[PDB]
Design a protein around this ligand. Structure first.
Ligand SMILES: OC[C@H]1O[C@@](CO)(O[C@H]2O[C@H](CO)[C@@H](O)[C@H](O)[C@H]2O)[C@@H](O)[C@@H]1O
Ligand SMILES: OC[C@H]1O[C@@](CO)(O[C@H]2O[C@H](CO)[C@@H](O)[C@H](O)[C@H]2O)[C@@H](O)[C@@H]1O
Length: 580
DNA sequence: GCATGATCC
DNA sequence: GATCATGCA
């Protein structure tokens, strides 16, 4: 049976109560400067549908939206907040975000619409956005009658679900997690996305020209070394040229056919000159297609800015991800690709890019959680953790540590920080599993506290059914009891690793909230632009650098108090590239 | 979809 | 182990 609601022609006072479920629908996935196709309000006085052209022009509605004392319950308030920012309208008073609440209760569910979140509580009087708007070449806004009911039902579900969701969160000791961390962070991210990052498109286009030339040269070379032309980007065709025509040895195969990953080519280079050229081609092509052309496609031509969207409710660790464009994987390791960063500049003249990043926050968090005396001492001494690790697993003095030993100790620390298997360590070190397991064993002999933690956490995960982070974020691990080795092993590593990475994510988010509050108190014009891995990236007047050099690291280092210090490195310059 | 590679090192 | 975007099929 249909749901009753007033399809209003104008805004009335009873639509402006001090508490309501609000829906400001933006159907386009990328909500930047996107259309708001409808509005739904549900409160103690009833259910209402307002046309945006009408509601957004009404002085009273706009003031209600911006009145922090008027509480709103929503789903993905950041989407609405940003869509509104593009229209010069402020959204305040969002006290409950169903998307963020669902995400915290179980990040594995992958809730991405009201219907999905409502299903968690046996509420089904609302359809999935997909069933209403369709998908792909069919994703279109339906007619007003269908549209109005869907938005009203979504608002109605939010209105009904707020209480049950808040109760479970409280039960999980996650109430402050939502209200004091995620929701306030949502507003900060909305500001960051809206501000965007200025791009020097001319510079990006020149690099593109230089890459095109290089690709052309390398391309022809490859054809001459193969004795013919073929689509180098076709791993199928390439495999035929490499493993059939040139008879190179097949050292690795993929479900589909011959493997041609750089991982394989490197080992094949000694056999034929074409390998190196193919590697160089892969590199240049990755920069041309993905970064040069990729970025240029999303830069707004009027402002020359890119406005990323931070998905705050996706990862199971709690880390934020970035899309359209993804500004968390911009080249930096190799100098050629690193140059790409010179294209990210301050949005104003005489402004500079300031970047601060946590130094080894994951291992510091592990030292704290596992209370490993050796590891804690290592950090209290601010030692080079990779050299320290090498010294221990290899039982040698600092001076006896060779570059290769540090490289491997570093690989072992990487495996600990990101939870990779002993097989993954082997693949990483180009050694055998048994050899990899051997290093792991030596590491545990040197850090018994970490060993104890690893064993205890896996046990706790099996007992409770989940693991938690410093700020109470949780991850359910149903596969921890699976009789399938590979499936169970994966769950065990996630049990060990999630409290580590998840806690680092918690800290980073709190630092962002603390930083923005300090920036405002100090009345600084500096503002956040991006959050990437374990770093915060800002831009500000050149006259604020000195104050920022002291303020940012302090705020970030004091976000939480652990058994070891938190350490933050910082740099700043004319472009993102120089913030090194 | 599958394979690849960029960032985490 | 994580993320997201690319070209090819
Ligand atoms: O608005 C971001 C927010 O929405 C979700 C669910 O609707 O993702 C949608 O928007 C993203 C940004 O364009 C897309 O990448 C994604 O495909 C689309 O479903 C949430 O996952 C996210 O937190
Ligand atoms: O031998 C105990 C030791 O083995 C691990 C392997 O990672 O776990 C195995 O043994 C446990 C019994 O104590 C099971 O609960 C677990 O499922 C099985 O894989 C370590 O966690 C543990 O320290």
């Amino acid at each position: 049976a249909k749901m009753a609601f007033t399809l209003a022609d104008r805004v009335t006072e009873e639509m402006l109560a001090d508490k309501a479920a609000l829906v400001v629908e933006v159907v386009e996935e990328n909500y930047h400067d996107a259309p708001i196709v409808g509005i739904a309000v549900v409160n103690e006085h009833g259910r209402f549908f307002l046309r945006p052209e009408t509601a957004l022009a009404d002085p009273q509605f706009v003031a209600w939206l911006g009145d922090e004392t008027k509480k709103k319950s929503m789903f993905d308030s950041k989407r609405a907040a940003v869509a509104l920012k593009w229209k010069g309208i402020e959204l305040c008073g969002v006290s409950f975000d169903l998307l963020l609440a669902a995400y915290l209760l179980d990040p594995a569910q992958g809730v991405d619409d009201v219907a999905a979140a409502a299903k968690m509580k046996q509420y089904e009087a609302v359809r999935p956005d997909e069933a209403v708007y369709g998908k792909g070449a069919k994703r279109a806004v339906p007619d007003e009658p269908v549209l109005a009911e869907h938005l009203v039902r979504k608002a109605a579900a939010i209105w009904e679900l707020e209480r049950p969701f808040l109760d479970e969160l409280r039960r999980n000791e996650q109430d402050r997690l939502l209200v004091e961390l995620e929701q306030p962070l949502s507003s900060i991210l909305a500001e960051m996305e809206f501000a965007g990052v200025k791009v020097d498109t001319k510079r990006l286009e020149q690099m593109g020209k230089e890459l095109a030339e290089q690709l052309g040269t390398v391309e022809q070379r490859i054809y001459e070394l193969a004795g013919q032309e073929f689509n180098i980007n076709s791993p199928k065709q390439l495999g035929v040229i490499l493993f059939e025509k040139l008879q190179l040895p097949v050292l690795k195969k993929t479900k589909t056919g011959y493997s041609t990953s750089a991982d394989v080519l490197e080992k094949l280079a000694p056999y034929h000159e074409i390998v190196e050229n193919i590697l160089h081609y892969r590199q240049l092509g990755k920069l041309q297609s993905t970064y040069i052309e990729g970025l240029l496609k999303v830069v707004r031509p009027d402002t020359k800015k890119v406005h990323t969207i931070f998905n705050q409710a996706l990862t199971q660790t709690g880390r934020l991800s970035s899309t359209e464009p993804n500004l968390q994987n911009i080249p930096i390791r190799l100098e050629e690709g690193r140059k790409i960063r010179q294209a990210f500049v301050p949005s104003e003249s005489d402004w500079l890019i300031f970047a601060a990043d946590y130094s080894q926050i994951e291992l510091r968090v592990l030292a704290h959680i596992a209370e490993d005396d050796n590891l804690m001492e290592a950090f209290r001494r601010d030692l080079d953790i990779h050299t320290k690790t090498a010294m221990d697993i290899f039982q040698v003095s600092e001076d006896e540590v060779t570059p290769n030993m540090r490289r491997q100790a570093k690989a072992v620390n990487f495996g600990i920080v990101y939870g990779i298997s002993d097989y993954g360590l082997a693949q990483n070190l180009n050694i055998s599993r048994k050899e990899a397991a051997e290093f792991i064993e030596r590491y545990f002999e040197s850090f018994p506290g970490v060993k104890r933690y690893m064993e205890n956490i896996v046990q706790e995960a099996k007992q409770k059914g989940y693991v938690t982070t410093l700020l109470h974020r949780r991850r359910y691990l149903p596969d921890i009891t699976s009789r399938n080795f590979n499936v169970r092993s994966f769950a065990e590593r996630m049990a060990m690793n999630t409290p580590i990475q998840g806690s680092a994510a918690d800290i980073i988010k709190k630092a962002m909230i603390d930083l923005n509050a300090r920036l405002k108190e100090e009345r600084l014009q500096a503002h956040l632009l991006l959050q990437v891995h374990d770093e915060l990236i800002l831009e500000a007047p050149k006259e604020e650098m000195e104050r920022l050099c002291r303020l940012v690291p302090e705020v970030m280092e004091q976000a939480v108090t652990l058994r070891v210090p938190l350490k933050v490195d910082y740099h700043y310059g004319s472009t993102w590239y120089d913030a090194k």
